[PDB]
């Protein structure tokens, strides 16, 4: 069934699993027409498919051309996400195919179950976790490869950089969810915190800065503060 706080350590066991987040698949800007009606213009999207154990991100870029002359786009987006995840799975060798796929939105269950009928042993699960994977487009290099894409593309990243050299997958996922929660709550402030010291750079092959263990504790502390302030503001408490 559903993945919650109670079964949280299961994310870091040796059963291959993938989170699928479809939030950034169908992206639009809403604008006024010359006649003063409203109209949407789609921009490039992305499926956010993550192994939480390894940090291996499968970023399927959804180019605007996939929407051309299609109807009910927000429904189609769920199905197209399900098609692409099913295609990814089939493309992996048997021993790399997941034993579970956790969707971050319950509306993805039926599309994904139906696209995965050929895989009866892969469990499709919802989650009670409010995961901030929507903020993935606040990571500059991910945002950059999506917006530049001129055709459908799959780009492979490690969202944990080299962190698993020094910390466990539990701690790496905690760090990642904290950075993404910060970026989601106040993007400007989060990005300021991450780059305010110019001596700390992002390696060409990395997504986040090259922080020492001490510096990660300072950063993580600054991210917690950012999240609580914004909360106190939101709710006047």
């Amino acid at each position: 069934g559903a993945m919650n706080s109670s079964n949280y350590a299961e994310l870091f066991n040796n059963d291959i699993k993938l989170f699928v987040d479809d939030t950034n698949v169908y992206r639009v800007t809403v604008h006024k027409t010359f006649e003063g009606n409203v109209a949407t213009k789609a921009i490039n999207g992305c499926i956010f498919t993550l192994n939480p154990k390894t940090g291996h991100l499968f970023l399927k870029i959804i180019h605007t051309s996939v929407w051309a002359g299609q109807k009910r786009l927000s429904q189609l987006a769920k199905w197209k996400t399900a098609e692409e995840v099913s295609a990814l799975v089939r493309s992996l060798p048997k021993e790399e195919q997941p034993k579970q796929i956790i969707v971050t939105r319950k509306a993805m269950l039926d599309p994904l179950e139906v696209h995965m009928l050929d895989f009866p042993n892969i469990a499709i699960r919802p989650t009670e976790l409010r995961l901030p994977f929507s903020a993935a487009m606040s990571i500059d290099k991910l945002s950059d490869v999506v917006m530049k894409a001129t055709e459908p593309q799959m780009v492979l990243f490690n969202i944990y950089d080299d962190w698993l050299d020094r910390i466990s997958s539990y701690t790496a996922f905690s760090r990642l969810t904290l950075l993404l929660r910060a970026l989601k709550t106040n993007e400007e402030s989060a990005k300021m915190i991450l780059l305010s010291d110019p001596t700390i750079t992002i390696k060409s092959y990395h997504l986040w800065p090259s922080f020492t263990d001490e510096q990660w504790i300072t950063i993580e502390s600054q991210m917690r503060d950012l999240i609580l302030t914004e909360y106190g503001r939101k709710y006047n408490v």
């Binding site: 429904q75 189609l76 199905w79 399900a82 098609e83 039926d110 599309p111 179950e113 139906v114 696209h115 009928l117 050929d118």
Partner: protein, 300 residues
């Protein structure tokens, strides 16, 4: 006009015949049911006074043989049996009739209710769903599970309804996942109508047989099969006009006959709200929507 004689009534019992029922007292001189209309299937059904659990009964057609009921004190139920001796049977029936020991099938001449509930139901199809080939009649009870319920456990005592599963390789063509899930026309028309049932008459017969099992025995798997078969039509964009017109007529008489007080257990809120209000056929079931809205507005 045909007859199902009873050898005796040794235990107090509520006896059902189609949509009618009679209380019989323990050792009452009851010797059966006469004037049973030829041309339809019938169901004789039982609910013991002492144990109001296990409703149970027999589907039969009088054209196929001479049938009687006899209590078995060992297995503790009213059993149907066939009498092969035509002259012994005629002589039993004439005696009980002369002594007026038989209730008359109480059909009102205006009243097409049974016809309307069993229009497509045929004994040959019931005997493929309920497999006991040595008998020309079929036993069903409250507790009998379906082939589909089993898969999710004694195969002999199962209800072999056609398995319908919206999230099955049967229901979904590879590369038509969204089309086939959101519009079940290919499942309905190619897989089920052309493929399995052969024609809408077999499909409607199973639908109507499933409802009657749900209504008369409170058989839960029967109710599930009845709703699945309604849902497959209503969830299909492409249905022959004649099938939609007939479905409206079928469903109207099922809703019309349902005991008012069992609507809560026999009707699936999600299926009915989806079929009448959300589905492709939301506007194709005028009679059904009007009786549902007038008789069970709570459910909707």
């Amino acid at each position: 006009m045909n007859t199902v004689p009873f050898t005796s009534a040794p235990i107090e019992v509520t006896i059902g015949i189609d949509q009618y029922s009679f209380n019989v007292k323990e050792n009452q001189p009851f010797h059966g049911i006469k004037d049973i209309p030829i041309g339809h299937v019938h169901v004789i059904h039982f609910q013991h006074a002492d144990n109001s659990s296990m409703r149970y009964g027999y589907w039969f057609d009088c054209r196929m043989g001479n049938f009687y009921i006899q209590y078995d004190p060992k297995d503790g139920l009213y059993k149907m049996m066939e009498e092969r001796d035509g002259a012994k049977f005629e002589n039993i029936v004439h005696n009980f009739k002369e002594r007026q020991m038989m209730v008359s099938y109480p059909k009102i001449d205006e009243d097409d209710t049974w016809y309307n509930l069993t229009e497509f139901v045929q004994m040959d199809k019931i005997r493929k769903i309920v497999r006991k080939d040595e008998n020309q009649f079929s036993y069903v009870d409250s507790s009998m599970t379906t082939v589909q319920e089993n898969e999710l456990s004694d195969p002999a005592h199962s209800l072999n309804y056609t398995v319908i599963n919206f999230k099955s390789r049967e229901a979904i063509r590879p590369g038509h996942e969204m089309e086939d899930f959101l519009d079940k026309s290919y499942y309905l028309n190619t897989v089920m109508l052309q493929g399995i049932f052969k024609n809408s008459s077999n499909y409607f017969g199973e639908l109507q047989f499933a409802f009657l099992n749900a209504m008369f025995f409170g058989n839960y798997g029967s109710s599930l099969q009845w709703h699945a078969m309604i849902e497959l039509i209503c969830s299909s964009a492409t249905v022959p006009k004649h099938m939609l017109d007939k479905l409206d007529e079928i469903l109207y008489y099922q809703i019309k006959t349902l005991p008012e007080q069992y609507s809560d257990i026999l009707l699936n809120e999600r299926v009915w709200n989806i079929c009448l209000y959300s589905s492709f056929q939301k506007n194709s079931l005028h009679n059904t929507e009007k009786i549902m809205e007038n008789k069970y507005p709570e459910l909707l």
